[PDB]
Design a binder for this molecule. Structure first.
Ligand code: HEM
Ligand code: HEM
Ligand SMILES: Cc1cc(N)nc2cc(CNCCc3ccc(C#N)cc3)ccc12
Ligand SMILES: Cc1cc(N)nc2cc(CNCCc3ccc(C#N)cc3)ccc12
Ligand SMILES: C[C@H](O)[C@H](O)[C@H]1CNc2nc(N)[nH]c(=O)c2N1
Ligand SMILES: C[C@H](O)[C@H](O)[C@H]1CNc2nc(N)[nH]c(=O)c2N1
Ligand SMILES: [Zn+2]
Lengths: 405, 404
């Protein structure tokens, strides 16, 4: 009936219509002819004004003062600013509204039922690579909260016309090193080879563990990146052990407790925040399945499989499956033991169902990227597998951005 | 420009320029992506222009475009359409179409096999009665005593101002689902509607968890007649776990032939509303979906209780654990009974070569990423890390409304 996407859940037979996507005024990667939905990365005062106006509108609507004289005065104030400085500034609580919106608007995040509880740290005053380090340390301390993790974000100055961006070069605040070996292999995390090399070029004296935390490479505007090392006590880690296979502890596997992305642009009302790191806490398959078992990461599947005594000779033993499950069980049980916040793929996807059900009533939809929302193990076994999803770009958004170098 | 496709496990990059040949539209626009939707939302030289293409496709396939045989065939088709508003395909053209329709189905992980397909021309069918005979034969050939074989049977095309040949059942083999007034459901919940359609057309229902349903066959503009499969055509496998003794006690079992009745074959503009096709199972279809899906047989918890696992909390991964034991029992049983089957690992590996062959022959391969990745152990298989482009090529297998 309705001229909007029909959306069906096949477990339950229930149907919904996404009316929110009518607000998506950025084009994604698909067209009538080809669907590029599996792609990870597909690729003026005039222009700013219209975005700004749309954000202020979103904001005043969020506090139910739409069309009020507060609202229409703010708007005038902004055009005034864009008029003389070619840009405009945000208010504290605007900023906070946007930072939560970009989280809420983020299609690849199963964790969004929490989008409301986000501590936003204003660092728009920060003026040095030194001070960035200080802000970042505060964040890590706060978000970690001794293993009782608290989602948070820290926002450094926005892009100014004709001036260097605040940029953090590492992809995450915590990243194990990747050491290109003499024989050709990589010691540690192969995902992090290039940054590991860059720290080195910039002065890092490098270890040779599998699990060496990298220093940060913080860049203030128009200045060469500066190297900062994290105090080992600030970086909580969890040693991985298994609840019934006593040998698993012997593999010496560790993961860090805090997932903190630091290379993503945060966009609000057309304002671009190039340094704006945020943190939540892990879903257990991020560690157990992708980070530890991906062919092109630590690739520890055959190794566990062999200790397990499995038939790694043939696919049909499902030796890969048995191994990956027990590795995931180990990530779960270890974090639990350590009193570090962790959520399994079942419980996370159940909560996302509730989120969808929530956002249905609240906005008439929730933009979602099915491929990224369905766990990388036991897909069919989680509710979101059977849940059709519409994906579109809403703003404020978290965007990808070129590596500074 | 043209889509840039990357493998995130190897670092390789391809370019799908075969997508440039899609002339059907998909559910997506630039503002919204509806790739995850299971179904869509639902004059005469358009037909001709579909036929002219297919004929060119066919003659280019056998290395003879522009030639005489091509030229004439083009005009044959033109003339038959101009005078009758439709036309017909010669059997070798049909066999080609049917094989392309398999090759182009973006949801199939098994297309490494696409050249090896037995085509039965059954367009000289004029009754429910004949339909049944053609189907009984499909099964015996395709089943092939458990050494399974890919086959399609093509019943007469749709025709303007006449009803359609239809097979009402979703698959030639399905288990009856009886809704018991207790809210609950005996058998396969996915099959309740068709079970009742069967009952009401005078089928004598059983009350087992795995009751093989009869076939409702419908020749044009007549009521569907009801035929019963001879038990020795329905090859079934009992499930049993290679190390868990107690598993065979579960009385589980699944048929061997996955054959689909309700889809529509489209070739050069012609539509075939009855054209069932079969292959062999991939183990996860049975082990994960059909037995563990909450809305199917849903045996996840029972098995888990039998494994003495911890139902109490999700974080013991009991769901995951039980599932893997199930998929194993399906791989065990089938391999023990010498019934063709393939595990999800073996399957996606072959698909990767298929992707590579396709990239070299046509410059691409239409793939539905969400359907290619198995229902367990996603990233544990190489297709997870492979970007895919999706689009509708013709010939094509399509969905179509149930005939009621
Ligand atoms: C609080 C618990 C959270 C959980 C369990 C969670 C879970 C996840 C997971 C599992 C992914 C996919 C990761 C991958 O495979 O790369 C993801 C992606 C994402 N999350 Fe969340 N998240 C949480 C908090 C947050 C917060 C606080 C924010 C923003 C302030 C956020 C923003 C995002 C974004 C933008 C992505 C997309 C990643 C990308 O585009 O590369 N998440 N999240
Ligand atoms: C020979 C071994 C084969 C294997 C292992 C295989 C595997 C699969 C799998 C796993 C699916 C996903 C279906 C689902 O999850 O429900 C699928 C779908 C599909 N396959 Fe294959 N297949 C095989 C043969 C064939 C043949 C012979 C044809 C056609 C002649 C075919 C065409 C299709 C089509 C059209 C779909 C989409 C089904 C739908 O939309 O419901 N495949 N196949
Ligand atoms: C807040 C957050 C929480 C959480 N639990 N997990 C989180 C995981 C991420 C991980 N996103 C990175 C995934 C990726 C994207 C692009 C490319 C490339 N090229 C390589 C990898 C980000 C934020 C997270
Ligand atoms: C050739 C073939 C081979 C094989 N191994 N498995 C195969 C499985 C199928 C199963 N497709 C059914 C999936 C579906 C589609 C639409 C709706 C609806 N509405 C509900 C379920 C078809 C063909 C197969
Ligand atoms: C090619 C494909 O998009 C890629 O492997 C995706 C698949 N799904 C994913 N899902 C999540 N959550 N994170 C990922 O990095 C990916 N990678
Ligand atoms: C909603 C979701 O797209 C739907 O359940 C899909 C997901 N992927 C699938 N993949 C396969 N192979 N078969 C399916 O039936 C489905 N179902
Ligand atoms: Zn799409």
């Amino acid at each position: 009936g309705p001229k909007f996407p029909r959306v069906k859940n096949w477990e339950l037979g229930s149907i919904t219509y996404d009316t929110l996507c009518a607000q998506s005024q950025q084009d994604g990667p698909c067209t009538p002819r080809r669907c590029l939905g599996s792609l990870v990365l597909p690729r003026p005062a005039e222009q700013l004004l219209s975005q700004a106006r749309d954000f202020i509108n979103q904001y005043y609507s969020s506090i139910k003062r739409s069309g009020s004289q507060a609202h229409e005065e703010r708007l005038q104030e902004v055009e005034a600013e864009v008029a003389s400085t070619g840009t405009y500034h945000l208010r504290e609580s605007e900023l906070v509204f946007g930072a939560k919106q970009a989280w809420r608007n983020a299609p690849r995040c199963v964790g969004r039922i929490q989008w409301g509880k986000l501590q936003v740290f204003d660092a728009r005053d920060c003026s040095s690579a030194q001070e960035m380090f200080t802000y970042i340390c505060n964040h890590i301390k706060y978000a970690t909260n001794r293993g009782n993790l608290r989602s948070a974000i820290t926002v450094f100055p926005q892009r100014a016309p004709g001036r260097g961006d605040f940029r953090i070069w590492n992809s995450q605040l915590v990243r194990y090193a990747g050491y290109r070996q003499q024989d050709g292999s990589v010691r540690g995390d192969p995902a992090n080879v290039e940054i590991t090399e860059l720290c080195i070029q910039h002065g890092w004296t490098p270890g040779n563990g599998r699990f060496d935390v990298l220093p940060l490479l913080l860049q203030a505007p128009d200045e060469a990146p500066e190297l900062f090392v994290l105090p080992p006590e600030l970086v909580l880690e969890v040693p991985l052990e298994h609840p019934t296979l006593e040998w698993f502890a012997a593999l010496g596997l560790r993961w860090y407790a805090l997932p903190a992305v630091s290379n993503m642009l945060l966009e609000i009302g057309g304002l671009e925040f190039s340094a704006a790191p945020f943190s939540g806490w892990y879903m257990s398959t991020e560690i157990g399945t992708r980070n530890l078992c991906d062919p092109h990461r630590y690739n520890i599947l055959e190794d566990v499989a062999v200790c397990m005594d499995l038939d790694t000779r043939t696919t049909s033993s499902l030796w890969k499956d048995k191994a990956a499950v027990e590795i995931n069980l180990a990530v779960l049980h270890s974090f639990q033991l350590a009193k570090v916040t962790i959520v399994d793929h079942h419980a996370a996807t159940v909560s996302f169902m509730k989120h969808l059900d929530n956002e249905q009533k609240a906005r008439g939809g929730c933009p979602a990227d099915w491929a990224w929302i369905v766990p990388p193990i036991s897909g069919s076994l989680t509710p979101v597998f059977h849940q059709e999803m519409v994906n579109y770009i809403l703003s404020p958004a978290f965007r990808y951005q070129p590596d500074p170098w």
